[PDB]
Design a protein around this nucleic acid. Structure first.
Lengths: 271, 44
RNA sequence: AGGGGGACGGUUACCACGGAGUGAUUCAUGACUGGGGUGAAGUCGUAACAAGGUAGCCGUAGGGGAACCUGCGGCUGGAU
RNA sequence: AGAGUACGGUAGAGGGUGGUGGAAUUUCCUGGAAGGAACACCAGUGGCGAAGGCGACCACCUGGACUGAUACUGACACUGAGGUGCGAAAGCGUGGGGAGCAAACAGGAUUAGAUACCCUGGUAGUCCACGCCG
RNA sequence: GAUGUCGGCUCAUCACAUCCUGGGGCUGAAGCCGGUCCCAAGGGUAUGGCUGUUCGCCAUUUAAAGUGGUACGCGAGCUGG
RNA sequence: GGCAUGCUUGAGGUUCUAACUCUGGUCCGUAAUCCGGAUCGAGGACAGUGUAUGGUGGGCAGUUUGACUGGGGCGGUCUCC
RNA sequence: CCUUGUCGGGUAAGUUCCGACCUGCACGAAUGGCGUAACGAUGGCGGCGCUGUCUCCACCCGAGACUCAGUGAAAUUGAAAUCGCUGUGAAGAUGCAGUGUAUCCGCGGCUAGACGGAAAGACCCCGUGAACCUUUACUGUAGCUUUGCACUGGACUUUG
RNA sequence: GAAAGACCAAGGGUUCCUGCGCAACGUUAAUCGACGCAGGGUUAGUCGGUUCCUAAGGCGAGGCUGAAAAGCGUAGUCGAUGGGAAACAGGUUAAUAUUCCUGUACUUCUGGUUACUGCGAUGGAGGGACGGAGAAGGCUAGGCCAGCUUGGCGUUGGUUGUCCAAGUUUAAGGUGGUAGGCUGAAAUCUUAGGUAAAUCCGGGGUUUCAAGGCCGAGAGCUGAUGACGAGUCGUCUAGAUGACGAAGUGGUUGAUGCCAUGCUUCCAAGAAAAGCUUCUAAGCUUCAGGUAACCAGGAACCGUACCCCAAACCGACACAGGUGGUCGGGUAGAGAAUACCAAGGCGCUUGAGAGAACUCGGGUGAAGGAACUAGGCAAAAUGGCACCGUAACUUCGGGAGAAGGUGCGCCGGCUAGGGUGAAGGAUUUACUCCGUAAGCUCUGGCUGGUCGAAGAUACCAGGCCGCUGCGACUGUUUAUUAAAAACACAGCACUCUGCAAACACGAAAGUGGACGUAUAGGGUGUGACGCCUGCCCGGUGCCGGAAGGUUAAUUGAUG
């Protein structure tokens, strides 16, 4: 965390997060692949998510969310920057060549770690089935179907706390604040994700948004009646509607979950 | 002050060419209307 | 004849007064304001002095027409 | 002789880091699971530090005095404007936490009225790291 | 099946119910100045500060800073506040 | 009053697997992140879809929104004595 | 709004401006309130310098204008032998009436008229015209949602 | 003269060149033409394409989906604006030339023959293979300065010279391994991986060595005693051609070119695939296949003329417009600005007079100096470099080039260095160090003198200051009357969303969100920052709640 001096009117509010033990260039080439941008656009060519476009060219890193090698110890080579996410990634070298990327946990640099059916818990970074993880311990990178890979708690500094256990399932409080029953056959990694000071950085200037591939938001009271329901009016009007999307869905409080096929898996909502 | 027609023989043939017209059903009947009118070119 | 040497010249430094630009620092004044003092005291009031009718007081944040209340650490200049 | 040191020996909430605790209370739920905070007794007109200050248990890196003497120094002294650090808590920083209470308030009962003491509720805060206020 | 605003600028032209200059009557006109009413249209008849202004209010003039008509004269003359 | 309970039709609950579902693993078609098939796992008679139905619904749509009138609007008026 | 409120400053004089006052027709705290360095082809004021902006224009230099040679358009146009005045008149006349002027025809200029030319008025009214937007107009409807019955089973129980 | 010059892509289509022509076309005339008529003209293993490879994206056997048409898509196979062998100089014409000719190269393929001989995949590895910025340093191209080659000796004073003018050229390729740059290295022992295998790669363990190795711009040769380089001598018709033809060296300064796809640094974290290098599989008779060598032959097809800061393209036009990229000399200069010029190109296809008003684009202006006007609109002014000096306020960066001032040409006198270089000496006897010296070049400091009204003398080149409103800022907007206070924005908050996510496009499959996962994504509002953001939950929305009343299809008691 550094705070830039105001030598120009754009650096006045740039709070920058710089890690000096991140690796200095040349990511691990046999484990990257090509990734082109969508612009938020369908296979019908239609903008289906707005405010997406531009940015920097990026390569996709084949980060392992499954952590399948069991019993084979992996040493950590280096922690790298990943353009595709807000977390860091750690290059692991298994005991038989076999480089892979995982999501880096907090406190890793050249440490040892092994995902298995019964690995050491003290080391944060060991992937493990949710049956034999001790209750009360903070985990991240939780699978949600066995074999599917990690899906939950994998942003920067994200974690979930394993709170209870019964039957074939296991209950864990999520970072969202909601209690979620998850199957105990599926894996999780002990610890907490690495780049937890990511919420401190300030972008500073409008260009810093534009090179993350994010594109400006016209707010709907600035549009015409044909463009948005927040219509027009003379002067600054205030959306005489109730506040609503550009497609007419109400936005300030209205619930939009309608899944029903996974409601029993959610033991308590965001409270 | 550039104008609306900026010529390109590659873009002309991939939008209006013969393979393009006969690739799709709606353009495959452009070529039959334009042949029923008796035109000299039918792909321009 | 002239020379030496003077005198008025020529212009070179020095400088008072004057000029210009931009600042300092002081003095008077200034619509309008904010407290202070002395009065006379009309007024909501009872805030302190008894265990002053909710014990006072001090620092400080915080909050409220007012003479005023809670908290955190503080003191009896606190008494049965 | 004043002042200092070489030698142990205890006494001591010195102070800080990390943990390990317990009951309540609180919050859940079918007696367990969960985490915050101050640690009844030992508590003392007791210790300790220049001062401010400071108590469960545990190690770990560290202070100054006392005293028992034995050694040596040879006034090296005290005080000290300026100068320089260091100073309770509410704070407001710059990041987190989260129980009870509670600054901020809403009403409840009360009075000419509560804006009060009483009654039902809760964020800032105390906690942590660096830093500022002094 | 179009007669395109207000004001300024430029250029005017006519009226007289006269602002100045010229001739007079009456006066509660001593004189200096005036008041009021006749006669008289020859020539003259501001400049600026404010405001988009017409006006107006002000500063300083002048012998005097007149009142009206002319598509509230004038945009195939200008400007465009 | 009713007794035990067989034979059974209505609303619960959690459960069972075999419908269904899986944008999970693994095989095979296959030299394929499609797709089927096989199997393992998960959910499970739920979800989801068809059909019938209540509710919401300017997201979208077809429209309506009178006449009189000393121009139009505002107001008044509109039939009968 | 009243309104150029009132007072102070700036000017010789200031409806603007600055600073105030509070009598806020009709400010107000994320349709954010009040400040704010830097920034601005931003709005309003004031000063220095500078000047043809102006008093008030003078001269000059090039390109048109004018003339000669060659080429050669346009809008418009019922027809024209196409004056002023004062009346009249579908109510502002080259054309009527009365009357004054006035030989015939170009060229250069200037634009007062020809209610000059250009666009079947844009304002306004009209039309049981249109379009597009709005909603708490009417009638619907996509989407979302509720239940019945299908796909859809057994097995005990709480239960009638 | 950073083009009004030379080129390339695109686009056009014969506009190119020559002979004959002038009706029409050409804003006039035309003998001329981008016009008419007829002939001619475009030569490639190396330049561009095809062929090889892929990106976005398109199509898409089967397949999934949909009234139909069709949608989506896997295997696949299309699609360059990217990646993949390789040539340069001088000749030559009316018009083509890296294509023809000459000379010297290079690259790849095929058939041979000879020798010893593990070959082989579309599969595994390696490689190709890459961002932004910023700097040194090494070079070269280019430029500038002499001898004598060569010609000159001046219409007007001087000019046999310390004078004048022109020329002083030469490539790819070989060879060298030159600065510099990256990096340890092989010998062996084995191995849960690179979906089978592997001698390759990856992982783990052992042996010694200071130098391996991989890349890499620059000279001299001789490529090259070659080619190029005024004109004579005579022939033929002032004018072509055959023969001959001279110097060709050195020191300076150098790039925006090359080393360099190098180094340093920063986050926004920076194409794929093939050719290539290598490994084995299924296979082979272990002939075929492989690897060198020698010999012999081959490299198809298509484009090539001309125009491109345009009269040949886009603009109805021989139209002040537009149009991607490349090169870039001299003096002044920071410069690719600008002025004047070189190479090169051009006089813009109506002219001639005349010298009114008025109109346009300028020049100077007495005395005033914003009195103009809606408004300093416009014009005038300021303008460079070095040094001095510089306020409020500030978010400590700024404001600031604030404001204001001084110096400035040319000629000498004196003086401080810096870079290059070598008369010869150290040795690694050479693509090297030390340092002679001069020469050449760059930047000072102090002192005079001198001329004009004036020395950043032209072109070029900020006007400044004081109160204020609004928006924080860079940015964006009504192509064609509005550039703003509007929009965007960083920051802020609210709300939804547990992943087959909310959401969006789709009768649907599917896709986007996202190969992301609550520090994330969508939506709404505010709009840096500082101080803050009061009261109201009735209405309407949303969130939660008992469980009562009313309520739909369905059911079908009873009459």
């Amino acid at each position: 965390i550094v705070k830039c001096k105001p030598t120009s009117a754009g650096r006045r509010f740039v709070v920058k997060v710089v890690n000096q033990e991140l690796h200095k260039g040349a990511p691990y080439a046999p484990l990257l692949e090509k990734k082109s941008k969508s612009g938020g656009r369908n296979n019908n060519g239609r903008i289906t998510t707005r405010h997406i476009g531009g940015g920097h060219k990026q390569h996709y890193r084949l980060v392992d969310f499954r952590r399948n090698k069991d019993g084979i110890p992996a040493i950590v080579e280096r922690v790298e920057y990943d353009p595709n996410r807000t977390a860091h990634i750690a290059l692991l070298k298994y005991a038989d060549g076999e480089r892979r990327y995982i999501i880096a946990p907090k406190g890793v640099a050249a440490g040892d770690q092994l995902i298995s059916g019964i690995g050491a818990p003290i080391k944060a970074g060991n992937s493990m089935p949710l049956r034999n993880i001790p209750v009360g311990s903070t985990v991240h990178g939780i699978e949600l179907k066995p074999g599917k890979g990690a899906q939950i708690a994998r942003s920067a500094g994200a974690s979930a706390q394993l709170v209870a256990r019964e039957g074939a399932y296991v209950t864990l409080r999520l970072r969202s604040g909601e209690m979620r029953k998850v199957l105990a056959e599926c894996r999780a990694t002990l610890g907490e994700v690495s780049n937890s000071e990511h919420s401190l950085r300030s972008l500073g200037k409008a260009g810093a948004t534009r090179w993350r591939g994010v594109r400006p938001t016209v707010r709907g009271v600035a549009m015409n009646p044909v463009d948005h329901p927040h219509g027009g009016g003379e002067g600054r009007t205030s959306a005489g509607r109730h506040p609503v999307s550009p497609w007419g869905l109400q936005t300030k409080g209205k619930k939009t979950r309608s899944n029903k096929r996974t409601d029993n898996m959610i033991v308590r909502r965001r409270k | 002050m550039k104008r609306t027609f900026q010529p390109s023989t590659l873009k002309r043939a991939r939008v209006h060419g013969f393979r393009a017209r006969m690739a799709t059903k709606n353009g495959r009947q452009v070529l039959s209307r334009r042949r029923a009118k008796g035109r000299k070119r039918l792909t321009v």
